[PDB]
Amino acid sequence: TNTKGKRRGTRYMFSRPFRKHGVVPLATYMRIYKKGDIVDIKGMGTVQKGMPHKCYHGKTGRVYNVTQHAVGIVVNKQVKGKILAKRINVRIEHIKHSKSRDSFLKRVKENDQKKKEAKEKGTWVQLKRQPAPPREAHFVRTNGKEPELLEPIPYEFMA
Amino acid sequence: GRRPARCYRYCKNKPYPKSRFCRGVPDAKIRIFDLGRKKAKVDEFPLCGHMVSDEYEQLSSEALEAARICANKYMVKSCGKDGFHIRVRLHPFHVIRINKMLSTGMRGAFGKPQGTVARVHIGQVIMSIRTKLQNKEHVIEALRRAKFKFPGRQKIHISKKWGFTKFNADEFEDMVAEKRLIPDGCGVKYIPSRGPLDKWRALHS
Amino acid sequence: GFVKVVKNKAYFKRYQVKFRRRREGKTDYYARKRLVIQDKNKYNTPKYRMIVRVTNRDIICQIAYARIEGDMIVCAAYAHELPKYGVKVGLTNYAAAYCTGLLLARRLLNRFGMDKIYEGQVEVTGDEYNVESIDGQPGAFTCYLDAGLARTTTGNKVFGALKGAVDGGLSIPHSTKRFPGYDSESKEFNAEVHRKHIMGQNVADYMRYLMEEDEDAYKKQFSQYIKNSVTPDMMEEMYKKAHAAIRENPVYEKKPKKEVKKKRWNRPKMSLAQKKDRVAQKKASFLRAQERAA
Amino acid sequence: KENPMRELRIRKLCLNICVGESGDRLTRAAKVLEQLTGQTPVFSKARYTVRSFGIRRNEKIAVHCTVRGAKAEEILEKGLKVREYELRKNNFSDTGNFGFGIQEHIDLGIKYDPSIGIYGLDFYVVLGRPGFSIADKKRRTGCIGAKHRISKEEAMRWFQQKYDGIILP
RNA sequence: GUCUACGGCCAUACCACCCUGAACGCGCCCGAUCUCGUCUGAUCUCGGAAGCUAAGCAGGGUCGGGCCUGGUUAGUACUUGGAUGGGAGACCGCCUGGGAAUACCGGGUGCUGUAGGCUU
RNA sequence: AGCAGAAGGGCAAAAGCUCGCUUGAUCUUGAUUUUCAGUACGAAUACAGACCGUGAAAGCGGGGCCUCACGAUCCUUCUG
RNA sequence: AUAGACAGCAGGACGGUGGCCAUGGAAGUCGGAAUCCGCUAAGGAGUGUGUAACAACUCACCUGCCGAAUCAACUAGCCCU
RNA sequence: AACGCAGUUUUAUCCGGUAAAGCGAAUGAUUAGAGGUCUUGGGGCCGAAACGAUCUCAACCUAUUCUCAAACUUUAAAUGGGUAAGAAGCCCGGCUCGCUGGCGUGGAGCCGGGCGUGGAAUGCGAGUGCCUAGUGGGCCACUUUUGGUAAGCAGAACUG
Ligand SMILES: C/C(=C\[C@H](C)C(=O)C[C@H](O)CC1CC(=O)NC(=O)C1)[C@@H]1OC(=O)/C=C/CC/C=C\C=C\[C@@H]1C
Ligand SMILES: [K+]
Ligand SMILES: [K+]
Ligand SMILES: [K+]
Ligand SMILES: [K+]
Ligand SMILES: [K+]
Ligand SMILES: [K+]
Ligand SMILES: [Mg+2]
Ligand SMILES: [Mg+2]
Ligand SMILES: [Mg+2]
Numbered sequence A: 001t002n003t004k005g006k007r008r009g010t011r012y013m014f015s016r017p018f019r020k021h022g023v024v025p026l027a028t029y030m031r032i033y034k035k036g037d038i039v040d041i042k043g044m045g046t047v048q049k050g051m052p053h054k055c056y057h058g059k060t061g062r063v064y065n066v067t068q069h070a071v072g073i074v075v076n077k078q079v080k081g082k083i084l085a086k087r088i089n090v091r092i093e094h095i096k097h098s099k100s101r102d103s104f105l106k107r108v109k110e111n112d113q114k115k116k117e118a119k120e121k122g123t124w125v126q127l128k129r130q131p132a133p134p135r136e137a138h139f140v141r142t143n144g145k146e147p148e149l150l151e152p153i154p155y156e157f158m159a
Numbered sequence B: 001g002r003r004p005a006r007c008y009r010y011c012k013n014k015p016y017p018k019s020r021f022c023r024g025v026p027d028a029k030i031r032i033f034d035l036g037r038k039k040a041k042v043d044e045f046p047l048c049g050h051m052v053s054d055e056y057e058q059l060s061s062e063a064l065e066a067a068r069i070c071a072n073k074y075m076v077k078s079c080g081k082d083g084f085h086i087r088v089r090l091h092p093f094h095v096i097r098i099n100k101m102l103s104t105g106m107r108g109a110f111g112k113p114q115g116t117v118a119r120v121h122i123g124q125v126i127m128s129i130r131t132k133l134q135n136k137e138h139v140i141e142a143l144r145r146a147k148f149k150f151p152g153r154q155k156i157h158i159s160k161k162w163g164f165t166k167f168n169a170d171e172f173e174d175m176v177a178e179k180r181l182i183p184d185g186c187g188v189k190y191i192p193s194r195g196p197l198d199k200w201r202a203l204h205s
Numbered sequence C: 001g002f003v004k005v006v007k008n009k010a011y012f013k014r015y016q017v018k019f020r021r022r023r024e025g026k027t028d029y030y031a032r033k034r035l036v037i038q039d040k041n042k043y044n045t046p047k048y049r050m051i052v053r054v055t056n057r058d059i060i061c062q063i064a065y066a067r068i069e070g071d072m073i074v075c076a077a078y079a080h081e082l083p084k085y086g087v088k089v090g091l092t093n094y095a096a097a098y099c100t101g102l103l104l105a106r107r108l109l110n111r112f113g114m115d116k117i118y119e120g121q122v123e124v125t126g127d128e129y130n131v132e133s134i135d136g137q138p139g140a141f142t143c144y145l146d147a148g149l150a151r152t153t154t155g156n157k158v159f160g161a162l163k164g165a166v167d168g169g170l171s172i173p174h175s176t177k178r179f180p181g182y183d184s185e186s187k188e189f190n191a192e193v194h195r196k197h198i199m200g201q202n203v204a205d206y207m208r209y210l211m212e213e214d215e216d217a218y219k220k221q222f223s224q225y226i227k228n229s230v231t232p233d234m235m236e237e238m239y240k241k242a243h244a245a246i247r248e249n250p251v252y253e254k255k256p257k258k259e260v261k262k263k264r265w266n267r268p269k270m271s272l273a274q275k276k277d278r279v280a281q282k283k284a285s286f287l288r289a290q291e292r293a294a
Numbered sequence D: 001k002e003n004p005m006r007e008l009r010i011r012k013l014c015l016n017i018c019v020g021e022s023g024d025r026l027t028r029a030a031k032v033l034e035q036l037t038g039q040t041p042v043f044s045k046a047r048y049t050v051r052s053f054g055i056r057r058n059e060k061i062a063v064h065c066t067v068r069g070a071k072a073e074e075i076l077e078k079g080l081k082v083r084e085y086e087l088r089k090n091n092f093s094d095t096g097n098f099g100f101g102i103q104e105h106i107d108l109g110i111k112y113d114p115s116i117g118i119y120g121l122d123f124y125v126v127l128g129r130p131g132f133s134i135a136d137k138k139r140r141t142g143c144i145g146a147k148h149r150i151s152k153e154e155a156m157r158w159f160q161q162k163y164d165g166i167i168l169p
Numbered sequence E: 001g002u003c004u005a006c007g008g009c010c011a012u013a014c015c016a017c018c019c020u021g022a023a024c025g026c027g028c029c030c031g032a033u034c035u036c037g038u039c040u041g042a043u044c045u046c047g048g049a050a051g052c053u054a055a056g057c058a059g060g061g062u063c064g065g066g067c068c069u070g071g072u073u074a075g076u077a078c079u080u081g082g083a084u085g086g087g088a089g090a091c092c093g094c095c096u097g098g099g100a101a102u103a104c105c106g107g108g109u110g111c112u113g114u115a116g117g118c119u120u
Numbered sequence F: 001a002g003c004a005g006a007a008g009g010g011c012a013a014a015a016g017c018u019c020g021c022u023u024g025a026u027c028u029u030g031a032u033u034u035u036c037a038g039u040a041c042g043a044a045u046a047c048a049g050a051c052c053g054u055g056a057a058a059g060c061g062g063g064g065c066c067u068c069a070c071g072a073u074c075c076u077u078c079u080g
Numbered sequence G: 001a002u003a004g005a006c007a008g009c010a011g012g013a014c015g016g017u018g019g020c021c022a023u024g025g026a027a028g029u030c031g032g033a034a035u036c037c038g039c040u041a042a043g044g045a046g047u048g049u050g051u052a053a054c055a056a057c058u059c060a061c062c063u064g065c066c067g068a069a070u071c072a073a074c075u076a077g078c079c080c081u
Numbered sequence H: 001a002a003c004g005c006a007g008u009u010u011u012a013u014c015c016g017g018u019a020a021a022g023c024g025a026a027u028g029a030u031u032a033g034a035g036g037u038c039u040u041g042g043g044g045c046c047g048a049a050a051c052g053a054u055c056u057c058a059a060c061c062u063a064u065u066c067u068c069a070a071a072c073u074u075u076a077a078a079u080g081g082g083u084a085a086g087a088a089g090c091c092c093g094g095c096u097c098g099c100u101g102g103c104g105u106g107g108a109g110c111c112g113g114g115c116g117u118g119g120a121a122u123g124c125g126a127g128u129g130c131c132u133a134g135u136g137g138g139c140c141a142c143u144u145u146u147g148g149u150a151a152g153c154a155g156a157a158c159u160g
């Protein structure tokens, strides 16, 4: 039976990367977090206050509260056979913006913008993404050069 | 005494080296890993013969010692007491354990150190002999005898490298003439065409 | 050959350099973090700080706020701008610090149209003053002093610039404890002593002190003051006129930009082909050198 | 010819009296060092506890002071006069400094006092060139360039030039 | 072309040794009356402007170390899923997909934001 | 190196050392995390309201750099 | 290996020299290192038997008869121990 | 004439330190030879009255070299974990605040209007409450995996 220690097994998890120790770069604190945005939780061992528990490291949540140094995040946590929406407070050193949400939010603007130009021009711009279709037909020019003949090589005992 | 080697033939446990967590390990049977003329210059012993393991098993320190003695003894008979150089390329670092059962049961069964073995991979070289080309037949025959001290299948392979270096024999002489291989005792030093030009100056001075 | 080379290849492999401005010894990131970082529940509200940097021959006063791409300067005042307002010499004295602090305060409030609304202390007493906001008017500009790597002992010139901005009308939290009038013995602050330092009287007493005993050292210590025909007697009124000039027209007039043809003063980076050729030349000369010698 | 900023000078002179015990001797030793320089010295404690030397940890066993400027120059002259303006070649460190010892302090033109006693002291001279303070300033702290560094030979020559001293092998 | 102040990223920026540096700056530098602090005006604080780029700093150099990046290593090692595959076993091969890391060999050696300055 | 201790993580104008001042180891209501049944205890995180310390100030601090160092009902005892 | 192999049937297997050290004995043949040269078809610083040392036999090497393939090592299938 | 969902992929993005690898990279372990040789010791010799000269062996340093790590690591997979893929969205105008504030600043809330190409694939109708029995000795197989010489042995992970 293992211990119930709050930081058991986080030897490598909360360690700093190689040659990345020391002062926390200040753009970390300059980020702006507002209610409703999506943040990636990643505990950093340099700051021991406002640590997320190890079960929330590598998880993504939604900010619901903002305080002087920390944010309240709603994170989905699977508890045996149920998923709970856990409300955790973590200092902003241990979070960062989820680029996935940022990329999607950009596409919504682009879709909405592209729709306005589709009305003033007739043309139908494709908005929905499509899975990689089967490759269409094409020709392959030999350009005079005959394809190189490949043969399996004899076995060589390299020890 | 020792259990039969069949009880520790397979790499069944994680590596368990002699460390601060594993105290009281008896010293391995094999202590001398290099024998013959270790000092012979790189160019004196170009021919190299290797005994290569064909199984993923454990070789005991006693087994390594017996083969070393067996190969050494024959090479002295066939080439001379200084006509070669033998290096054992396996060091027994894996500690095997024994749960001493002296007339309780399996309670607290974690054993005590018994000896050391060398976990060998398929294709890992077990021992190497470098000598003159005229003594190739003896090096195969000497390594053939040492094969009978080990469990499992072993293969004898005459290396195309020069001696105990990592450079091909057919091009070793050319690289030495072009100063890309400076003889450094037993082996050679590779001269990269980089680094301060002063080093190039000395070499060509 | 006895000592293990500490500066060996593994030493450099594992070496983590500090931040560039820490390596340069310019910024204290421990204090920087506490200075420029805003509370997250204030979002994009800027946190303005007053940068005061006393140099060998100049005083730099700036108002800045932090952004990810870098700090933004909204107002900068320099001590070398004081000759326009009257002060020709002593540009790095406590009196010049007060003027540079006053100049930055008026220059900023003038850019924000707050100068007419907030005047500060027009007449200097050296006492404790704090500008308070007026109801129905925009609130007083609030910034925090950034002393950088300076030691904040009493009488530090960064507090001189702080006094100038405070009297200029900028709301900066502070206490009189670090002004020159503060007495560490009685734990009492003397406003009159502060005013003498602000008006440059300690420099005035110094110049009088030299002229009495050693005229030769007086010329050595104040040669440029003698050149600018400024005397201990006229020092106070010189700064009184300077404060009037600053409060009158604090606007900065950028130096007329004059185009000049591009000129290169430093060597550019050598090309790889040149570097390869240089090594090839060196080797060829080396072989000939042995050829002629042998 | 030579840059005026490459001139060697006395950065400081460090005077140390290691009495080896706390009590009457250290207090009197401080008075010797105080009246030799005019500066109140400071007491150095023992980092270890050595039974052989009879010293315990955190026990004041030595008295030392640092002197600079003209006062350090003139005290140095008294020291070399006692040493007859001659030093062994090995007295010079590889960092361009050198030092010597004085067996009796009254050899330095100091009147002996029965209620004080006679004392020996250690003299260390730290040389330097203008600009060495960049390694000591808080802001924009910099490390001196290789050429500025004073080599052992240039410390020995400076001693021969200034005090026309003698270097013994 | 470049500096100063404040920076963001935090070595492509570090480290060693060297060469060069107009202008302005940054410096070193001179001094201790005042402020302030020291065993020591060295540091720190303050008041300056005789000298110097010697140093710092800046640019450049070096078959330089490091770092960054690419190749090779190598479809190798390892691996998802599959078989009434082989083998006494140890282990191995194949099918289905994924796919590294040294040594070794090339290339690079800070970018940039705000404000102010300098370069007929 | 050190940071009381086991170890692991973290830390260099500091979290180490030395010095100065202090009592944020104080008063109070909730929320949350950890074990989890998602109960309790313990411990912890982020706030809020008082009253304070420190610093020029930003700010930091309601115990120890973080991960352990502890205890229901009934009863007794003390305080308002 | 048709410029004659392999097998078989027969001859030579020499001089320096009993090469050096060592050993009581060591003359190719107890041991350790050197393992070279006129002489041809070849003969060695010897593959073995043998002697206290010799001697002697014998082997590689080469020739006569012969007239088409043959020799050595290794490897892995089934089978066998 | 669809409300929504998923033991699944795709797209985007984040997480990780196992496999492997590495040790001429840190920590720990470990074989050999080579070159330096300042100092440090020994052997030994000249000198021998004194240093002194000189050689060797070690130690020590430098560049190489053999072999390793569950409780080492610069690197670093495969499989895997989280989140997002819109109408609770977007866009425009206005208002409230005792919070915040140089600034109708920042933030939040509220009100009105406008806009459907329902903004990846595939499949499926979902949501929600009450009462509730039995069970709470398990065992086996692939692959991973601990102790043990091993066990039709003891103990885990995953799916069946
Ligand atoms: C252990 C005891 C105090 C505990 C804090 C406590 O609360 C005990 C509790 O009341 C026990 C009850 C609780 C329960 O709900 N009902 C039961 O009736 C018993 C006492 O410790 C001693 O002072 C002496 C200790 C020495 C040993 C001898 C006697 C213990 C006396 C003290 C009763
Ligand atoms: K466990
Ligand atoms: K445990
Ligand atoms: K310079
Ligand atoms: K406060
Ligand atoms: K290692
Ligand atoms: K039950
Ligand atoms: Mg704490
Ligand atoms: Mg096991
Ligand atoms: Mg075998």
Ligand SMILES: [Mg+2]
Residues within 6 Å of the ligand: C031
């Ligand atoms: Mg500070």
Ligand SMILES: [Mg+2]
Residues within 6 Å of the ligand: D022, D023, D026, D027, D060
């Ligand atoms: Mg005393």
Ligand SMILES: [Mg+2]
Residues within 6 Å of the ligand: none
């Ligand atoms: Mg000075």
Ligand SMILES: [Mg+2]
Residues within 6 Å of the ligand: E053
């Ligand atoms: Mg120069």
Ligand SMILES: [Mg+2]
Residues within 6 Å of the ligand: none
């Ligand atoms: Mg390089």
Ligand SMILES: [Mg+2]
Residues within 6 Å of the ligand: none
């Ligand atoms: Mg690469």
Ligand SMILES: [Mg+2]
Residues within 6 Å of the ligand: none
């Ligand atoms: Mg610790």
Ligand SMILES: [Mg+2]
Residues within 6 Å of the ligand: none
């Ligand atoms: Mg501090």
Ligand SMILES: [Mg+2]
Residues within 6 Å of the ligand: F042
């Ligand atoms: Mg507990």
Ligand SMILES: [Mg+2]
Residues within 6 Å of the ligand: none
């Ligand atoms: Mg509070």
Ligand SMILES: [Mg+2]
Residues within 6 Å of the ligand: F063
């Ligand atoms: Mg605390």
Ligand SMILES: [Mg+2]
Residues within 6 Å of the ligand: none
């Ligand atoms: Mg067969």
Ligand SMILES: [Mg+2]
Residues within 6 Å of the ligand: none
């Ligand atoms: Mg059979």
Ligand SMILES: [Mg+2]
Residues within 6 Å of the ligand: none
């Ligand atoms: Mg792990």
Ligand SMILES: [Mg+2]
Residues within 6 Å of the ligand: none
């Ligand atoms: Mg491994």
Ligand SMILES: [Mg+2]
Residues within 6 Å of the ligand: E101, H021, H022, H075
């Ligand atoms: Mg690796």
